[PDB]
Amino acid sequence: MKGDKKVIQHLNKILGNELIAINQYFLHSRMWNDWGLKRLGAHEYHESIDEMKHADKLIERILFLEGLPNLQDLGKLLIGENTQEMLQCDLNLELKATKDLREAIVHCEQVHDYVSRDLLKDILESEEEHIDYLETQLGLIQKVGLENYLQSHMH
Amino acid sequence: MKGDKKVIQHLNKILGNELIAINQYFLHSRMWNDWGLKRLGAHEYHESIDEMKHADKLIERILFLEGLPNLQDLGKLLIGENTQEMLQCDLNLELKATKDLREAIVHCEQVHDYVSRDLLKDILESEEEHIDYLETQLGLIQKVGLENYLQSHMH
Amino acid sequence: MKGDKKVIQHLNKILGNELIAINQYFLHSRMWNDWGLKRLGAHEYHESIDEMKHADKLIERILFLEGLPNLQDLGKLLIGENTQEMLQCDLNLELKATKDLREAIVHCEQVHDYVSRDLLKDILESEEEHIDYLETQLGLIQKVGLENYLQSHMH
Amino acid sequence: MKGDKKVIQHLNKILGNELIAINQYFLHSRMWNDWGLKRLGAHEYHESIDEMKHADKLIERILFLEGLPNLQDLGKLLIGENTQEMLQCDLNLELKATKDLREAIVHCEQVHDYVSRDLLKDILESEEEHIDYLETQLGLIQKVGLENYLQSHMHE
Amino acid sequence: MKGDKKVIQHLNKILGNELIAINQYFLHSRMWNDWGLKRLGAHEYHESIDEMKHADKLIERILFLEGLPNLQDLGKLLIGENTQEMLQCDLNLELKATKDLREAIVHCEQVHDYVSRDLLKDILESEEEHIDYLETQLGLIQKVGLENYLQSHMHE
Amino acid sequence: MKGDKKVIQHLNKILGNELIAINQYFLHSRMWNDWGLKRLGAHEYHESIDEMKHADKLIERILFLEGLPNLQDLGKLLIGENTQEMLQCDLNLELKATKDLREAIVHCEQVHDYVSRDLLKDILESEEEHIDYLETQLGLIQKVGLENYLQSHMH
Amino acid sequence: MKGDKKVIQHLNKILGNELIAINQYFLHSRMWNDWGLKRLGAHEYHESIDEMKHADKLIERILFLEGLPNLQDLGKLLIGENTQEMLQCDLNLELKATKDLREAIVHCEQVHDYVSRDLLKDILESEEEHIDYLETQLGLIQKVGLENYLQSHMHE
């Protein structure tokens, strides 16, 4: 079904953000596992898988709309060197992702692509839940101390 | 069955205290959840539900006694800004609640409303168990230290 | 995540409406139970619980957006003195609630808070279902007569 | 297998009646549900589904006989505005439906289309059962009073 | 709860489209079954049932909004006479249906009927999924050839 | 119970038709199996068994009516030499069979043998279902092509 | 445990090949699904997941050896426009992948990193199974014809 060209551009931009996040979260996950922080590693793995699910839906929507999904261009991964930096890198990425999602929703609404808007709203809800998680973890580090925070994520 | 007017007044006073506690505990619960202190959030949620159960029994008793349950007047919520303060606000509210319960029981006994006395005694038992819990949490903050106390209430 | 100040104001207004409804429906429920109209009492209890669930989600959203949920200011309960009046009082409350929900949604859309919009839309769907129920009951009182209507809600 | 042209016309006429009944009963059902008369709404929903089943068999038969099932021409829905009227509208429709079924059976017998006759007889049995239900409901309104009758149909 | 008059008109227009689709898909289904293409017949039957579900929700919404659901006016059925034509007729109908859904959503948003908007959005998602299916089937006829495509739809 | 002589003659004629069909379908079934077209062989076997069931009921009815069932006179089998011819031969046989069934029913109705009429009507319904199947298969040969049609009946 | 720097370079090169394959196979899967060729889509999805598992093991090994896994540099995806081209693009990628795996194993053996060699051997066994599958599919297109090949991959 022939889609709006600018909608497809917006969907590919969001897909590009999700592809960064997949790799960034997967690497952070395996770094935490290598350090013995297996609870952080598992949670970050599941964040990576969630982003994959969003990417899948975007790819499927772009193909339905007769566009070409762009899996070739990969933007800059924000990789931290320690736990606090890795969480902050994830948060910085998510805040850019939600800005782009809002701009895409505006355009979908203007051209009456209400199904694409709904898909993007569902993705936005997931990303705001991730922001909540990340803000909460950074706050916990300040409240319980870094050593305790890391201890709680060993097992 | 026509109840004693001053009994009904006392029952409405206790109901008023329970309505404050329902809202105070519910908000404290959701603050703790928002901060990632989910064990505190869950326990405080169940404290809110317990107060709802007491309020239900008071409302039923007042209606049986042909009085009007007052759910309109909401007194001052004591909301803390950190875990230590939230627990102490709950304790301050519970100590006022038990004072009012004792005065209500005195009057029930004087006018031979032994069933209302028994209901208030059961509520007083629950409130003293809550005081025990709160005093114990504040003691644990001292004995294990704040960072450990908060850490223990993350999961 | 810092929310829009007016969005948070609107969410607190909707929360205030839900807090009125919780208490109004809970009292109406216990009045109906006291009168032996147990089917009305049970259904109205479940309406109270449904409003509690909405209030919970609003409180959680407000806190995530770094606002202060207002559980202190309780507006006017609309309490009836007989079944038709109680049903009409619930309906009057719901009609005010849905007007406020629509105004809140308009503002969320304007400032691109699409997740808050979605939460409010879900609440609005529940409130219109409650309006449907209430209008239906008032219609049934006319169709089957008040005595039969009450009879059908004894058990 | 090429059927008799007039048999196919009769089958399409009965199909036409069933298509009216499907919509009329479905709308009546949802009206009753909207008023809180859920027992009437559920029963009328099942009457709509039963008509759908008859329509299905007529469509299948017409196609087997190499005719064209007519789902385009929808006749007049008899929509009532209160319970007694809605039941009476259903009854009025069914009485027309059974007259048409009888005339179609006559013609099937004359041209020896005994399988089409048997299908129409089965549908006629269902429609007479519906007439029994409807006459009974109208009678009950008279016997128990309208308010009680509606009361008894609030809950499933 | 009295709805906006133009919202109710839009809802009745979408209902009208769904009523066409119910009959068109049901007839196509039984045509395919009669030809021995039972997999197409079953899938098209389920498309007819899906449209019935949407019609039901629109009828319920219109009644809640104190309007009159229009089940009397049935527009033009697009009946094909071979598999490719039947799929194309379904697609042509769906494309008209989604245009009307979009215009109705616009108006619901303007008058703040956000619940009606959400219902129409859900229906639009289902109809775009149907367009996906239909475009895919037409594409497969081109890729695998018509004879193979039909062969693959003989058996369930 | 003494039956009408012409009714019994008609029932024996229909029985004769069924006996032809039993053998014709059984042979066609085993030809298709020998050629590796097992789905056609199985379906045609079940057509043979269905005709056996009809023959059984006719024999039982004839005997009840105190006639002599004729299993001796076997009419001409219509055996094809390839799949399309075999299907067409079955259809030609079925078209003769249904003509004879209609004539038999006319006579049963005239002499008020309504039970024999009902048995013949049931047999006629089965035979028209078989006609539907056969016409459909011949149509499928045209729609999917002979090679594909045969391929679909291998397994 | 400090690994050999050239081993880590080789592991990152193989990881880079796996990252290309994950995306190429995922896109090819979703293209085949969009075309209704669901059996090809499903199989290609599972090929993508298999490459993800290999990438995970490589990342884990690189981190254990105190290297930095490179998930940033993504080489050229080879995307086909039709089924035959997509299969050949996958095959071309796999042949490059196995050449790089063999060179990595040579170097692991030279510096006595026998555990890294064993990991790469396991990945190579999987990649040669993928090559077997791809060569077989291309051969089946020649043996049964493209239309039949595609037909056989419509349904899972």
Ligand SMILES: O=C1NC(=O)c2c(NCc3cccc(O)c3)cccc21
């Ligand atoms: O909080 C409240 N508890 C009540 O009972 C109440 C009200 N009662 C109205 C009423 C009066 C007399 C008999 C009745 O059956 C009901 C009105 C506003 C607020 C409240």
Ligand SMILES: [K+]
């Ligand atoms: K009664």
Ligand SMILES: [K+]
């Ligand atoms: K083939």
